[PDB]
Design a protein around this ligand. Structure first.
Ligand SMILES: *[C@@H]1O[C@H](CO)[C@@H](O)[C@H](O)[C@H]1NC(C)=O
Lengths: 33, 49
């Protein structure tokens, strides 16, 4: 068990529905909802 | 107004800090009443109250 702490609280009013990811052209990243 | 929630606010003024006396206090938006004393409790670097 390990807890997550806050970092940033950006007050920007955009709406987000889809995202993406970068690769620095052995990679593995997991996604949950 | 009513767009891009408030980000340009006026300056906020401050006063002196007193201890061991019944004083009304407003710590960054928390209103109350009581006597303020130093404490040995330790928070985490991101916790406020
Ligand atoms: C969601 O995005 C739409 C634009 O597609 C925008 O008009 C609306 O204000 C956004 N809502 C929130 C809560 O961000």
């Amino acid at each position: 068990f390990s807890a997550l702490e806050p970092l940033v609280d950006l007050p920007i009013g955009i709406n987000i529905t889809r995202f993406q990811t970068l690769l620095a052209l052995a990679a593995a990243y997991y996604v949950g909802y | 107004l009513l767009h891009a929630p408030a980000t340009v606010c006026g300056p906020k003024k401050s006063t002196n800090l007193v201890k061991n006396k019944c004083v009304n206090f407003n710590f960054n938006g928390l209103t109350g009443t009581g006597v303020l004393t130093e404490s040995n409790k330790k928070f985490l670097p991101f916790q406020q109250f």
